Each structure stands twice: as structure tokens, then as C-alpha cells.
């Protein structure tokens, strides 16, 4: 079991790329990793996930984030199943793919359901600083939505680079679009900041805790 | 903390429409719910969150899911609060408010990040037998988007009913938009029963692992 | 739980006007506090009971008394409920108030009636060598009379300046007005002293005990 | 210690008017008590006190309020001080004083001071049920002002009797004399019911959470 | 709880005459003391001892012995009743008075009787080498006869400074008037030296162990 | 140890008049009893303290009270001093005495002072419910008055006849001679009972609190 804001846990990963280190081998190259689990190979709706992680993997590293799949399976199945995905689909897999034998890193990270021993559908936004930023637990009977995800990291790239919040589906939000949030002043005296940088058009506002700007 | 597939605790929460006990007052009624929780009251992400989520309270009330947020605020500053997007944004907020006290049901949930006293935003799908069917854990900087939620109550309401598993981004799936897949063959004589199915026109396939039909 | 003549627990806390260290932000400059919870932003007595005291502020400020205000509630409301007094009533606040998360600080404090999570209306005065010097704890049903506590200080302050006790009502007491009582003598000495002050005109006296003069 | 709301101990006390059990004698009548406590006998700022609350004891017991106090000294120390009160300051004292040996209930109700053997300045006030209803803790250097207490007594007494809450410094509140609060509205419910009210002339309001009436 | 022989316990106590230490305060003087209590002020038989120990301080202080009294009262009582004592039977009290808070060296001494508080008469001659060479106790119900404690320092003053024993009654013995004992003796060879010291006229026998002497 | 009021342990023993049960022989009786100890036999001061209290026998028997006295030698020592004291003195000793082995009574009653082992000169007074009414510790080297004994025992006597207090001296006290105390007023309504009983000559008094009355 973990939490939001907690370092991912140091863990050697057998992959289909070898053998690696986890936060390191992202967080040393200034990477963020995306760490995806699934039940099992050759099953179905993990192949229609894959399959989807795949035809979207450039959009991830292009903002400088690594997909990273798991289940409780070895190697050799892995390569066999993204095989199979190449052959019938034509979209080779160019992510890699942990064998997390006996569930021991899908433990640590809370991703098995109750009476289980297998994964279900589990999603870890890992920064290059190795902080675990958000975490979202699917069943098995349900697909994830990988646009979700996309939309997720590329709000929290933003966040860290502007120092701001993103609104309820940024960045088609209902009321302010692709505008970003700024942190609601928390004192008086940064209630006088908002007051001033509105009554000379740097911010827009609602109210002094609900201010917002575009990018 | 929770896993999926465990059950709700029992518990008694103050809301803004009075003290009910949770699962019950749902459960008992063949009601699901989604609980999610944010960070505090007057705060700008959580405010758009609202307005989104009343903007949808009757898309989940169809499918019999009723909606219920948290925040460790009090019910007079929920109130409040509400009433300021009824007055600013003219959206009456009409799904219950639970104002969790000292964190309490927030921490048995495990709401809280790393270091934080307060929530951040969790989402929890919890049916009409009181299990947790799905966990989300956005943190206080990203907005969630309610559409994902709506789309995953909607695509479990139907595993449920049909027995079936839902394929990534269904009902949009890339290879087949809004159809259902069938529980993979897990024993040889399933396998027999698939391949039967198929030339049979029943179901499709792409193998016998991969079998899937129109609802 | 405490009494008066302990220090103020040392403890950090988060107000609206930032972050502040007790007892001694107030105690390094010299100035006195006076510590008083509520139970709730958005509640009626309370705000009878902030707008009077704001209505005060620079009498018990003149004194070097700063008043300071406490509940469980985050700052966003804190600055909210502000914000409304300032806006119906016409008057702005300008003491700090305490978001005491969790009833933390209120707990140290015994501000928590008997089977409660949120405080009552308590009041400590606290001098600036930081000890506790006088105790009110009255519960949400009733509120405050401000006068009384300035009254206090204000007699608090003179006993400090001058060596004296004041009476019952001071400066309005039945019996002596606005003169102030001269500790009793405790000892044959000390009454030998008292003989003597009164036999030439230095004090007043009904009694070698009982012993008073004007300021 | 003690904190509000809780039950007043079960105790039997030597007192001037001989041994009575508290709160029983009181309760078992259905009358209140104030009961406070002073340092010493033969001492002044006590003595201006003791004069002051027999010439209110009236006040209190037309009310069903009985005064009682305390001190460490013995009944025959008592005597002899109340009647230097009645020969010198003209009031005989009609009102019971507890002689607690060894501050025995002193230490249960936490009278004593840092540092101190005997109590200072405390008031408890005690309702029919034996509830502790609000308590004060005023050093031994300044004498209390007794309007406040029945000030307060008479809050209390109308605040269960009229179902209200009472306002900063009521009967004289700043904002609406003596006027009396209605418990704010904590559910959507009871928020269409405060409206209801008030358009319907039986309340007058600020807002919904702030609504008051003459009684 | 102590006994004849041991030294008196190191105490500081707070007098009539200020704050001292015993044995201290009266052995580094070469004084001895005569240390009573008795159980309240302003009771009858405790003023008549009182009254009957000042018409005698002389005759102890004389001797190099200091009346010192003790009773669980504070000094605010002490002197009050001192000063009844001067104004009605015209004896001013010039022997200091313990104020001996919550019997806390009543406790140490055993002066406390079975089931009580309170101290009952007790009296403790201590000499200069603080060792307590006599103790008295006296319940309430009789009051002392200071004569025969006079007679008991004399006795023990004379016992010390020429090496010998009193007889009963002594300087009234019916047998041998204000002659004084010798040792016996505890040896044969200390019998030779009586049998000497009788047949050249130096002490009077009845025998070898009863052997008397002008002082 | 022992304190007055305390019950005397039940103890068997051996005396010059046979072997008896403490306190039950006397109590069993209606007679009271004064234990005194010395040190030995053969001794001096005990010689003549011994011859004097025979002299006062029936003095003490006229009122119910019983000689016994104590010491840690045997009994053939007992008599044969007992008839040193009748060959020498021309007194035959008629109250019984304990042999008290191994100083076993003794210690039990804290007869024996700091690094001794056997007893000095103390007395108890011991009335006919067994219980220890005043306790008397004298040092070898000062010889007893057996008339301040009688004094007390008479005093005592009369307490309990008359529900009355003695003064210091009594009955040759210096206020009042042979009058006796009234107990003290403790509550008003007592006080309003002393002053009827005087204005109307029941009792003379020098204030409420000091009643006294020829018996």
C-alpha cells in the first residue's frame, strides 16, 4: 500500500528490456514513468489496452513520459502475447513490460483486489523526482481510457512548470476552457496580491480564491 | 486504507442532508454511489469540480449511482459554499456533502497525501452490495474529468448485467467501438465452447482468448 | 488540558495572516494575547461575537493586547466568513485567526466540551512572557462579553505595573471604586508595615489585611 | 481536571451550613448553583467579592440559581471571617462556603494554579442534571465582575428554555439587543425552513445561517 | 511517624514570622524548640493554650527554648486569631505559628489522629542538636498542661549539661525533693566507684543503682 | 507504630498477675487502663516513678482506670524489685506488671526510641472500647508526673460524661478554673444556638465560638 506524495519504492524490475531499476533508470534521465498493471496475458481487454498504449506511446515520451506495463507473468509470455499484438494488429509493442513474479511489486503498491492473486488494472504517475503524483485502481472487467492519463500527466507537467492548478477537464474545461487555476490565497495579505494583479489585467477572477489566467 | 472488491465500512456520516449511515441509506435502496473528496470549500479546481458534477447529477441518477462528495470542512461552510455556485454559476447542488470531521473516514479510505492533514481528490465506486468497485486518487493540482467516471459507472452497471468485461475506451473502442468481450476460455472445454460460438455467428473473434459481440 | 500560571504550549500554527510560532511572535515584541475559539465559520453568535470584537481591536491593541481567534476550519473559510461580516456589517477584521486542524491546538487546550470534536467559546489571556495568566470556557449557547475580558486584561496589566490586587468590579467596585488592594500582610512584619503606611497617610485600610490606595 | 458538559463529581462537602452532597442537595430540588472558589479567608480582593455576591443573592435564587463557595480553610475560619463582613460592610452572607480540607475538590475541578496549594478565583455553574454548564478560572490578582456570571446563568436558563442561542453580550447585543438566535440551519432542509420562516414574519434574518427573534 | 532519638525532619515552613527552615532556624542559634500543634483557629481550648503559652514565653525562652506553634489554617487565619487573643484577653502572641498547608508536616510527625485531617495537640521538644528528645500528644477533646512541658525542658536542659536523671516529679520528688539521679550503674567495677563515692559524702543511696545528689 | 484513636491490638500477656488479653481484661470490665513503660528494673527514676503511682492507685481506681505498667525483663525480676520497692519504700505495688519478651509489645506500640532496645518512659491511655485516647513518649533521663496523668484520665473521663471540651489546665484553668468547654459552633445554625443558650443563661461565652459553662 502506498500514498500520493510518497516516493515510489526502490525495486529491481525483470523487463522485456532487461533487467532495471525503478524510480532510477526514468528519474535519471529527467523521465516520468507511467506504471500500468494488467491480469494477465493473452487475455482480451488488456490487449485492446495495450494495443491502445502503443498507438499512443510518442505522445507520452514527447512530453518526457515512459509507459511501463506489469503483470504476474514471465518473460517469455510477454514477448509472446506482444507478438501476438504485432501479428494481428500490426503495432509492435515498444514499451516495456514487467514480469512481476509472485506478485511481489504489484503488493508493495496495493494493486491485487480483495482475494486475489493476480493484478487487476492499475495506473501509477511516477515524476523524475520518483514521486508517486496519482494513482487510479480499474477492475478487471473494466478498460482503462488511456486519453484519461494523457490529459492527467500533461496537467501536471504544466502544473510543476507554472506553478498552477488545473480546472475539472482542463483543457476544455465548462466555464474556463484551456484558462489555468491559481492557487486560492490563503492569508490577507495574499488576498491584497489577487485584488492587485486583477485591477491591472494579469489574472481573471470570480473571487479572490478563484482566479484564473490563460497559459 | 482499501482494495478494490473489499467492502464500505460501516459507518455514520454528518452530510449537508442530514446523518446517514454508509453503504446503507444507498445500498438498502438498490442505490450505487461515487464518493469523491476534495482538498476544501471555497477552493477554486473543487468548485469547478461541483459545477461539473451537478451539471451531471441526473446522467448518474438514471443509472440508479448517486452522487456524494467530502471534504474535513464543516456543513456550514459546505452550505455555504454551495450557495456561492448557486449564486455565481446558477447550479443549485443537489447530491449531499459529507463533512468529515478530523479526517476520520478520509484516513480509514486512505484520502490523505503524503504529509497532508486534508484530502485530495479520490474518487470510490462502491455498488448496491456496498463493494468498492473502482479507486481513483487525483491529487489537489488536477481536476478530475466526471465523463471518465460516467463512463466507467456505465461500462460496469453493463458487466454486471450481461456478464461481460469492456474493452479500452469503450463504448469507443479503436478495434471494436461498442462492443462487449466475453470472459476469456480459461479451460480447454471453454475453448471448445468459444470456437462452437464462433462459427455459429454468436459471437466474433480474433482468437479464442479474444471473442466479443454486439450487446 | 492546562492551568494558569503554565506556559503556553510552543506550537506552530497556520492563520490568515500566515503562519505564526506561539507564544512568541507575540512575546519577542512584547505584547500579550488573548486566545478565543468558536465553534464554526458561517455561525450567528460567533459572528455577534467577531464583529464585537473587531469593534474593539484597538482598545485591547493600545494596552500591547492582540486578540486572536480560533476553529476548526480551514483558512479559505475563515477568510470567507470574514469577508462576510466585512461585507453586511461593515466592518473589516483585522486580528489573525487559527485553522486548528483536527482540534489539534484546541485539544492541548481543553477548548473541546465533553463529547465534541469542535470547540466552544474559550478564552486565555497569555502575557508576554508567554504564561496563561486567566482561563474562560463558556460553552456555543452562550456568548461572550468582550467588555469583561478587557476589563480583565486591563486589571491584569495594572496588578503586573504596580504590585496591587484588584477588587471585585474594579474600576467600578462597590466598596472602593478605582482603587486598587495592597497584597495582605503575611507575616507580624508585614503588619507592622501596614500600621505604619496607614498612620501616615500612605494607604487606606479597613483592617490590617484588607489595605487599599488610590493608583 | 473538568471540561463542559460534563457531570459534576459525586462529593459530600463540609460547608458553613453543614455537610450537604453535590449536586444532589441542589438538583435534588431542582435548583442550579454557581460555585466558586476563593483563595483565603481574611483576604481582600475575596472580601469585596463575598459583599458583592450577598448583595446579589437574590438575583441568583429568584432565578433557582444557589450561590456556594470554597476555599481551603476550615468552617470555624469561615464563620468568624463572615461575620467580620457583617459587622464591618454591614451584609450578613446567607450563601453556604465549603471548607475543602486539603483542596480535595479543589484538585477534582483543577482550581489550583501552577505552582499553588490553595485554589484562586473559579467559577462552575451547574445545572438541575448536574451538568457543568461553563467555567472560569480567574487568578487570585484580580477580582471577577458577578454581573457577568448572572449575565451568563440567565443566558443559559433561557437558551434551554426557549430552544435559542444568546448573542455577544445579550441582553445588550450590539447588533440585536436582546434578541435571541436561532440554532443556525445545518442541513438543505432546515435551510428551506429558515426561509419559510422568515418570509412569514416569524424570524428575522441576516442570511439563512444567521436568523434571530424577540422572544 | 517518628521517635524519640532521631533527628527532626528537614522542613521548611511557612510562619507568622515569615518563611523558615527546621531544625535549622532555631539549632544554628544553639536554641532548642518546643514545637505544638493544635487543630483550628478560633477554637476555645487552642486559645486558652494559647493564652497560657504567651504568659509563659519567658520563662521558656530564659531556658534557651522557643514556643513554636502548627496548625493546617492558612496565616491570613493565624493572625486573625492572634490579634482576637490580644484584643480580648490582652495578651499579643509573640511565639511564631505554622501554617502547616494540607498537614503536610502534621503528616510526617504523626499528629494527625485515627480517621482525621485535622491535627489533634501534639507536642515535640527538640533540642539544638535538632534531635527530639520528648513527644506529647494530646487529642482535642483535652487541653495541655504547659507546666508540665516547662518542668520536661528543665528536666531534660539539667539531665544534659550535668550528666544525670531526673526523678518522677522532679524538683517536687516526694522521696528525694530537687536531689537529682545518677547513672546507674551497669558494671561491677562502676559498682566500686558508687561504694567510693558514698563512703567520702559525695552522692546519697538507697543501693548501688539508685544513687542521688544535690546539683 | 499507633495513633490515637486507634483501637489496642489484641495481645496476650504475661504480667505479675498472671497471663491477660490487652485491651479485653479491662475493657471486658468497664475499666479503663494507662500503660506506662520504663526502661528496666533495678533502675532509679523508675523507682521512684513506680512508688509514686502506687501511691496514686486508688485514685486512678476510683474512676475505673487500671494501673500496668511495662518493661522487657521477666518476671522473677518484676517481683523481686517489686519487693525492693516494699522493704525499702514501705510500699507493697498492687497494679500488675508485663514482662514483655523480646520488647514484642513495645515495638508494636513504638515504645522504644532511635538505636535502643528496650523501652523508655511512655504512656497510653486505653479507654474501655479499647481505644487509645493519648499517647505520652518521655526519655529515660526525665522521670513522668503521674499528676498531669490523673489530670488527663479525669479530664477525659469527664468529656465523655458530659459532651464537653477541657481547657488548658483544667480544672484550675487561668480563664475559667473549673469550667467546661462547650464544642466549638461549626455551622450558622449552631452559631444561632450558642447565642440563644447565652442570652438566656444556659452558658457564659467570650464570642460564639468559646462557650463554656460550670458543670
Known amino acids: 500500500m502506498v500514498v500520493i506524495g510518497e516516493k515510489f519504492p526502490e525495486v529491481e524490475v525483470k523487463t522485456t528490456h532487461g533487467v532495471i531499476k525503478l524510480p532510477d533508470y526514468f528519474a535519471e534521465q529527467g523521465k516520468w514513468f507511467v506504471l500500468f498493471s494488467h491480469p494477465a496475458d493473452f487475455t482480451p481487454v488488456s490487449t485492446t489496452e495495450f494495443y491502445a498504449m502503443q498507438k499512443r506511446v510518442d505522445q507520452f515520451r514527447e512530453l518526457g513520459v515512459e509507459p511501463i506495463g506489469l503483470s504476474v507473468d514471465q518473460v517469455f509470455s510477454h514477448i509472446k502475447w506482444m507478438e501476438w499484438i504485432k501479428e494481428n494488429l500490426g503495432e509492435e509493442i ?21 482475494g486475489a492473486t493476480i493484478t487487476a488494472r492499475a495506473v501509477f504517475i511516477v515524476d523524475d523526482k520518483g514521486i508517486i503524483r496519482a494513482i487510479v485502481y480499474y477492475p478487471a472487467e473494466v478498460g482503462r481510457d488511456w486519453d484519461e492519463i494523457l490529459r492527467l500527466v500533461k496537467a501536471l507537467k504544466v502544473s510543476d512548470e507554472k506553478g498552477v492548478a488545473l480546472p475539472h477537464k482542463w483543457p476544455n474545461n465548462e466555464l474556463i476552457g484551456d484558462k489555468a487555476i491559481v492557487p486560492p490565497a490563503s492569508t490577507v495579505d495574499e488576498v491584497k496580491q489577487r485584488e492587485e494583479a486583477k485591477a491591472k489585467g494579469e489574472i481573471e477572477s470570480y473571487d479572490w480564491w478563484f482566479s484564473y489566467k490563460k497559459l
Open 94 to 114: 515498444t514499451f516495456p513490460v514487467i514480469a512481476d513474479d509472485r506478485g511481489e511489486l504489484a503488493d508493495k503498491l496495493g494493486m491485487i483486489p480483495s
